[PDB]
Amino acid sequence: MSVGIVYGDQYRQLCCSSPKFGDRYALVMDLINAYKLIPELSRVPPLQWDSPSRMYEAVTAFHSTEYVDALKKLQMLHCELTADDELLMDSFSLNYDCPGFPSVFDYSLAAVQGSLAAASALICRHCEVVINWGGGWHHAKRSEASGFCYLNDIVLAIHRLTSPNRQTRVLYVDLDLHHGDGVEEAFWYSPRVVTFSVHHASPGFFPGTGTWNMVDNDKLPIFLNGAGRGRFSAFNLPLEINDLDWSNAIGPILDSLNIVIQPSYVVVQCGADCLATDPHRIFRLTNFYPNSGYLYAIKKILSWKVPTLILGGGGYNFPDTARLWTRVTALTIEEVKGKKMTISPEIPEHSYFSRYGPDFELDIDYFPDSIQKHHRRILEQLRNYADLNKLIYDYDQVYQLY
Ligand SMILES: O=C(NO)c1ccc(Cn2c3c(c4cc(Br)ccc42)S[C@@H](c2ccccc2)C3)s1
Ligand SMILES: [K+]
Ligand SMILES: [K+]
Ligand SMILES: [Zn+2]
């Protein structure tokens, strides 16, 4: 019922203004349009503020005044650096892996604009599900920029998320290869927003969080999962993996969270760093139809009949990221609108066609205990969280999932 997608001319220009990603958003958008999926999707234009003060209020709802001012100064100055300017940019980590360029603030803000527009569309009940491939930056902190993430659109969108109903709870699920540290930290003390991440964790791997907590004692390391009343609310799955193993690792956890928490809204990060074709070469996820962990997770999330917001994020293989996200968009249309879509395995000729070689197939050119202990730990954590928040559940079906 009226799936949503976020795109616009200025949105296209500014989302494709990052030297790291280049024209990834342009390729993704052109691949959705080339398969004639745009007429099956409702346009959600990015949200604009009537005054710069309103934008400041919206952004600083999570971030700090000094950080936003420093990012604006970086954008202004890049359009040499003084010693004090270098010092201030280093203090906020506005360099190194987050380099400056003339459109840092504009692009980082456009991502938040799209995410907040999707949030408003979900709240107003205009769209059952809204999609935004220009956002999904889960590494941005209050007073820090990490992993080319300057503004955390996810945190602000979740915060923005009335009928009589009752207390509102939002379930965040992160499928990026890297840990959702920013969203977890933002809602570390909040039980209403339940943050879950599935990621790779190895020593020296960015960021190194979402795994066993290293402390100074002889006891075995444990998993930190919140504080105060937001304790036991942060869930993380660190994995050392193919589509089937990833699907079996994710399924029971997300089903248990949906059953227990009973959230009003769901927000999914679909960063494409887990693809086997990704240059990082960590996980072995694909985009294949016959039954891909991405598609399985998305379908199982959509099966809950809960309003959902899908975001992009990580991914360096722009054509294959576009293939994955186009398949995800088509499957969302099929699941929500109830209208099947027959995606042509041969990629239609379009603008960026030349970059989808050399086989020009929709499927990507790739030819293909820890988990049970993790399952038990997350099951106990979910039990503790449910008892802490006094949630009603049978404690029998959830065990049967595992
Ligand atoms: O957006 C992301 N996930 O969603 C990211 C994951 C990793 C990131 C951070 N990073 C890294 C490189 C790099 C080159 C530019 Br230009 C800008 C940022 C960069 S090479 C590597 C590296 C960094 C530091 C030292 C050695 C190698 C990791 S961005
Ligand atoms: K993740
Ligand atoms: K939390
Ligand atoms: Zn990533």
Side-chain angles (χ1 to χ4, degrees), residues 138 172-180 196-200 236-237 269 274:
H138 63 168
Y172 174 59
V173 284
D174 197 306
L175 274 64
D176 191 297
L177 181 60
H178 303 93
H179 176 229
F196 169 56
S197 185
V198 49
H199 40 279
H200 176 66
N236 291 314
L237 188 72
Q269 208 272 8
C274 312

PDB file of all heavy atoms in Angstrom, residues 138 172-180 196-200 236-237 269 274, ligand 2:
ATOM      1  N   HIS A 138      25.364   5.302   9.953  1.00  0.00           N
ATOM      2  CA  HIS A 138      25.192   4.913  11.346  1.00  0.00           C
ATOM      3  C   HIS A 138      26.441   5.105  12.197  1.00  0.00           C
ATOM      4  O   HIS A 138      26.422   4.754  13.380  1.00  0.00           O
ATOM      5  CB  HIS A 138      24.738   3.449  11.426  1.00  0.00           C
ATOM      6  CG  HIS A 138      25.727   2.471  10.872  1.00  0.00           C
ATOM      7  ND1 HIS A 138      25.620   1.112  11.076  1.00  0.00           N
ATOM      8  CD2 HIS A 138      26.841   2.650  10.122  1.00  0.00           C
ATOM      9  CE1 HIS A 138      26.623   0.498  10.475  1.00  0.00           C
ATOM     10  NE2 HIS A 138      27.378   1.408   9.888  1.00  0.00           N
ATOM     11  N   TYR A 172      15.246  -0.873  15.610  1.00  0.00           N
ATOM     12  CA  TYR A 172      16.295  -0.597  14.639  1.00  0.00           C
ATOM     13  C   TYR A 172      17.086  -1.873  14.393  1.00  0.00           C
ATOM     14  O   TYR A 172      17.564  -2.499  15.343  1.00  0.00           O
ATOM     15  CB  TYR A 172      17.217   0.515  15.136  1.00  0.00           C
ATOM     16  CG  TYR A 172      18.411   0.766  14.245  1.00  0.00           C
ATOM     17  CD1 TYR A 172      18.249   1.116  12.912  1.00  0.00           C
ATOM     18  CD2 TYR A 172      19.703   0.645  14.735  1.00  0.00           C
ATOM     19  CE1 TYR A 172      19.338   1.343  12.096  1.00  0.00           C
ATOM     20  CE2 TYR A 172      20.797   0.872  13.928  1.00  0.00           C
ATOM     21  CZ  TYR A 172      20.609   1.220  12.609  1.00  0.00           C
ATOM     22  OH  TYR A 172      21.698   1.446  11.801  1.00  0.00           O
ATOM     23  N   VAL A 173      17.211  -2.257  13.126  1.00  0.00           N
ATOM     24  CA  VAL A 173      18.000  -3.413  12.719  1.00  0.00           C
ATOM     25  C   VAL A 173      19.045  -2.938  11.721  1.00  0.00           C
ATOM     26  O   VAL A 173      18.711  -2.280  10.727  1.00  0.00           O
ATOM     27  CB  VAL A 173      17.121  -4.526  12.127  1.00  0.00           C
ATOM     28  CG1 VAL A 173      16.383  -5.257  13.235  1.00  0.00           C
ATOM     29  CG2 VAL A 173      16.126  -3.948  11.141  1.00  0.00           C
ATOM     30  N   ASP A 174      20.308  -3.260  11.991  1.00  0.00           N
ATOM     31  CA  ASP A 174      21.428  -2.832  11.162  1.00  0.00           C
ATOM     32  C   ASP A 174      22.057  -4.059  10.521  1.00  0.00           C
ATOM     33  O   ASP A 174      22.481  -4.984  11.225  1.00  0.00           O
ATOM     34  CB  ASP A 174      22.459  -2.061  11.988  1.00  0.00           C
ATOM     35  CG  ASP A 174      23.417  -1.259  11.127  1.00  0.00           C
ATOM     36  OD1 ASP A 174      24.045  -1.841  10.221  1.00  0.00           O
ATOM     37  OD2 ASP A 174      23.540  -0.040  11.359  1.00  0.00           O
ATOM     38  N   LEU A 175      22.136  -4.026   9.186  1.00  0.00           N
ATOM     39  CA  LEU A 175      22.650  -5.188   8.415  1.00  0.00           C
ATOM     40  C   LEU A 175      23.999  -4.845   7.767  1.00  0.00           C
ATOM     41  O   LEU A 175      24.489  -5.687   6.992  1.00  0.00           O
ATOM     42  CB  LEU A 175      21.624  -5.517   7.322  1.00  0.00           C
ATOM     43  CG  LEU A 175      20.447  -6.431   7.676  1.00  0.00           C
ATOM     44  CD1 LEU A 175      19.519  -5.817   8.715  1.00  0.00           C
ATOM     45  CD2 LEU A 175      19.655  -6.764   6.421  1.00  0.00           C
ATOM     46  N   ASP A 176      24.573  -3.666   8.055  1.00  0.00           N
ATOM     47  CA  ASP A 176      25.861  -3.295   7.488  1.00  0.00           C
ATOM     48  C   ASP A 176      26.953  -4.215   8.019  1.00  0.00           C
ATOM     49  O   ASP A 176      26.818  -4.824   9.084  1.00  0.00           O
ATOM     50  CB  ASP A 176      26.178  -1.833   7.822  1.00  0.00           C
ATOM     51  CG  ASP A 176      27.372  -1.294   7.054  1.00  0.00           C
ATOM     52  OD1 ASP A 176      28.493  -1.811   7.236  1.00  0.00           O
ATOM     53  OD2 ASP A 176      27.185  -0.343   6.268  1.00  0.00           O
ATOM     54  N   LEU A 177      28.038  -4.330   7.252  1.00  0.00           N
ATOM     55  CA  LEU A 177      29.175  -5.128   7.698  1.00  0.00           C
ATOM     56  C   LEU A 177      29.765  -4.571   8.986  1.00  0.00           C
ATOM     57  O   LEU A 177      30.247  -5.327   9.837  1.00  0.00           O
ATOM     58  CB  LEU A 177      30.235  -5.176   6.601  1.00  0.00           C
ATOM     59  CG  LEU A 177      31.510  -5.982   6.842  1.00  0.00           C
ATOM     60  CD1 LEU A 177      31.185  -7.439   7.098  1.00  0.00           C
ATOM     61  CD2 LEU A 177      32.439  -5.837   5.653  1.00  0.00           C
ATOM     62  N   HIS A 178      29.737  -3.253   9.145  1.00  0.00           N
ATOM     63  CA  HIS A 178      30.274  -2.599  10.325  1.00  0.00           C
ATOM     64  C   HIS A 178      29.187  -2.423  11.381  1.00  0.00           C
ATOM     65  O   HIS A 178      27.990  -2.446  11.088  1.00  0.00           O
ATOM     66  CB  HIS A 178      30.886  -1.250   9.949  1.00  0.00           C
ATOM     67  CG  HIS A 178      31.955  -1.349   8.908  1.00  0.00           C
ATOM     68  ND1 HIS A 178      31.698  -1.208   7.562  1.00  0.00           N
ATOM     69  CD2 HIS A 178      33.282  -1.592   9.013  1.00  0.00           C
ATOM     70  CE1 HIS A 178      32.821  -1.351   6.884  1.00  0.00           C
ATOM     71  NE2 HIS A 178      33.798  -1.584   7.740  1.00  0.00           N
ATOM     72  N   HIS A 179      29.625  -2.252  12.624  1.00  0.00           N
ATOM     73  CA  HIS A 179      28.697  -2.153  13.741  1.00  0.00           C
ATOM     74  C   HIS A 179      28.004  -0.795  13.758  1.00  0.00           C
ATOM     75  O   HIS A 179      28.607   0.235  13.445  1.00  0.00           O
ATOM     76  CB  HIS A 179      29.433  -2.383  15.061  1.00  0.00           C
ATOM     77  CG  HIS A 179      28.573  -2.197  16.271  1.00  0.00           C
ATOM     78  ND1 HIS A 179      28.959  -1.427  17.346  1.00  0.00           N
ATOM     79  CD2 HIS A 179      27.343  -2.673  16.573  1.00  0.00           C
ATOM     80  CE1 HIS A 179      28.006  -1.441  18.260  1.00  0.00           C
ATOM     81  NE2 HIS A 179      27.014  -2.189  17.815  1.00  0.00           N
ATOM     82  N   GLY A 180      26.726  -0.801  14.131  1.00  0.00           N
ATOM     83  CA  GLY A 180      25.966   0.424  14.285  1.00  0.00           C
ATOM     84  C   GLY A 180      26.261   1.118  15.598  1.00  0.00           C
ATOM     85  O   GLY A 180      25.399   1.203  16.476  1.00  0.00           O
ATOM     86  N   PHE A 196      19.534  -3.217  17.315  1.00  0.00           N
ATOM     87  CA  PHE A 196      20.132  -4.505  17.003  1.00  0.00           C
ATOM     88  C   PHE A 196      21.036  -4.360  15.788  1.00  0.00           C
ATOM     89  O   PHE A 196      20.692  -3.670  14.825  1.00  0.00           O
ATOM     90  CB  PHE A 196      19.061  -5.563  16.728  1.00  0.00           C
ATOM     91  CG  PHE A 196      19.605  -6.838  16.156  1.00  0.00           C
ATOM     92  CD1 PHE A 196      20.596  -7.546  16.816  1.00  0.00           C
ATOM     93  CD2 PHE A 196      19.138  -7.323  14.948  1.00  0.00           C
ATOM     94  CE1 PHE A 196      21.101  -8.715  16.285  1.00  0.00           C
ATOM     95  CE2 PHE A 196      19.639  -8.492  14.414  1.00  0.00           C
ATOM     96  CZ  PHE A 196      20.622  -9.188  15.084  1.00  0.00           C
ATOM     97  N   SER A 197      22.192  -5.015  15.839  1.00  0.00           N
ATOM     98  CA  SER A 197      23.168  -4.955  14.760  1.00  0.00           C
ATOM     99  C   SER A 197      23.689  -6.351  14.462  1.00  0.00           C
ATOM    100  O   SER A 197      23.853  -7.159  15.380  1.00  0.00           O
ATOM    101  CB  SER A 197      24.332  -4.029  15.131  1.00  0.00           C
ATOM    102  OG  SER A 197      25.231  -3.876  14.050  1.00  0.00           O
ATOM    103  N   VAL A 198      23.940  -6.636  13.185  1.00  0.00           N
ATOM    104  CA  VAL A 198      24.654  -7.842  12.772  1.00  0.00           C
ATOM    105  C   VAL A 198      25.867  -7.401  11.963  1.00  0.00           C
ATOM    106  O   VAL A 198      25.728  -6.676  10.970  1.00  0.00           O
ATOM    107  CB  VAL A 198      23.757  -8.803  11.977  1.00  0.00           C
ATOM    108  CG1 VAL A 198      23.015  -8.077  10.867  1.00  0.00           C
ATOM    109  CG2 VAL A 198      24.580  -9.949  11.412  1.00  0.00           C
ATOM    110  N   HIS A 199      27.058  -7.825  12.384  1.00  0.00           N
ATOM    111  CA  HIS A 199      28.275  -7.239  11.844  1.00  0.00           C
ATOM    112  C   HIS A 199      29.430  -8.219  11.980  1.00  0.00           C
ATOM    113  O   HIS A 199      29.313  -9.266  12.618  1.00  0.00           O
ATOM    114  CB  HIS A 199      28.614  -5.931  12.562  1.00  0.00           C
ATOM    115  CG  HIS A 199      28.376  -5.985  14.038  1.00  0.00           C
ATOM    116  ND1 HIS A 199      27.128  -5.817  14.596  1.00  0.00           N
ATOM    117  CD2 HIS A 199      29.221  -6.219  15.069  1.00  0.00           C
ATOM    118  CE1 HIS A 199      27.217  -5.930  15.909  1.00  0.00           C
ATOM    119  NE2 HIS A 199      28.477  -6.174  16.222  1.00  0.00           N
ATOM    120  N   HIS A 200      30.556  -7.857  11.369  1.00  0.00           N
ATOM    121  CA  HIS A 200      31.811  -8.573  11.542  1.00  0.00           C
ATOM    122  C   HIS A 200      32.644  -7.886  12.617  1.00  0.00           C
ATOM    123  O   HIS A 200      32.710  -6.654  12.664  1.00  0.00           O
ATOM    124  CB  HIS A 200      32.594  -8.630  10.231  1.00  0.00           C
ATOM    125  CG  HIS A 200      33.940  -9.272  10.360  1.00  0.00           C
ATOM    126  ND1 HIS A 200      34.103 -10.605  10.673  1.00  0.00           N
ATOM    127  CD2 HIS A 200      35.187  -8.761  10.233  1.00  0.00           C
ATOM    128  CE1 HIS A 200      35.392 -10.888  10.723  1.00  0.00           C
ATOM    129  NE2 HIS A 200      36.071  -9.786  10.461  1.00  0.00           N
ATOM    130  N   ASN A 236      23.789  -7.263  19.648  1.00  0.00           N
ATOM    131  CA  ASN A 236      24.833  -7.302  18.633  1.00  0.00           C
ATOM    132  C   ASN A 236      25.174  -8.744  18.299  1.00  0.00           C
ATOM    133  O   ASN A 236      25.284  -9.583  19.198  1.00  0.00           O
ATOM    134  CB  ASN A 236      26.087  -6.558  19.102  1.00  0.00           C
ATOM    135  CG  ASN A 236      25.873  -5.062  19.194  1.00  0.00           C
ATOM    136  OD1 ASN A 236      25.315  -4.447  18.286  1.00  0.00           O
ATOM    137  ND2 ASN A 236      26.319  -4.467  20.292  1.00  0.00           N
ATOM    138  N   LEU A 237      25.341  -9.024  17.006  1.00  0.00           N
ATOM    139  CA  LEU A 237      25.736 -10.341  16.510  1.00  0.00           C
ATOM    140  C   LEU A 237      27.061 -10.197  15.773  1.00  0.00           C
ATOM    141  O   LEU A 237      27.091  -9.813  14.589  1.00  0.00           O
ATOM    142  CB  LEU A 237      24.662 -10.940  15.607  1.00  0.00           C
ATOM    143  CG  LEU A 237      24.887 -12.395  15.189  1.00  0.00           C
ATOM    144  CD1 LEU A 237      24.668 -13.336  16.363  1.00  0.00           C
ATOM    145  CD2 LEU A 237      23.984 -12.765  14.026  1.00  0.00           C
ATOM    146  N   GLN A 269      18.807  -0.695   8.290  1.00  0.00           N
ATOM    147  CA  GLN A 269      19.994  -0.247   7.574  1.00  0.00           C
ATOM    148  C   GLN A 269      20.451  -1.377   6.659  1.00  0.00           C
ATOM    149  O   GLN A 269      20.663  -2.504   7.118  1.00  0.00           O
ATOM    150  CB  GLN A 269      21.099   0.153   8.550  1.00  0.00           C
ATOM    151  CG  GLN A 269      22.061   1.204   8.013  1.00  0.00           C
ATOM    152  CD  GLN A 269      23.228   0.607   7.248  1.00  0.00           C
ATOM    153  OE1 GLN A 269      23.263  -0.591   6.975  1.00  0.00           O
ATOM    154  NE2 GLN A 269      24.193   1.447   6.898  1.00  0.00           N
ATOM    155  N   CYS A 274      28.520  -6.047   3.002  1.00  0.00           N
ATOM    156  CA  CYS A 274      28.553  -7.485   3.244  1.00  0.00           C
ATOM    157  C   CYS A 274      28.586  -8.305   1.962  1.00  0.00           C
ATOM    158  O   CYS A 274      28.761  -9.527   2.032  1.00  0.00           O
ATOM    159  CB  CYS A 274      27.343  -7.912   4.077  1.00  0.00           C
ATOM    160  SG  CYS A 274      27.027  -6.894   5.526  1.00  0.00           S
TER     161      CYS A 274
HETATM  162  K     K B   2      25.579  -3.885  11.346  1.00  0.00           K
END
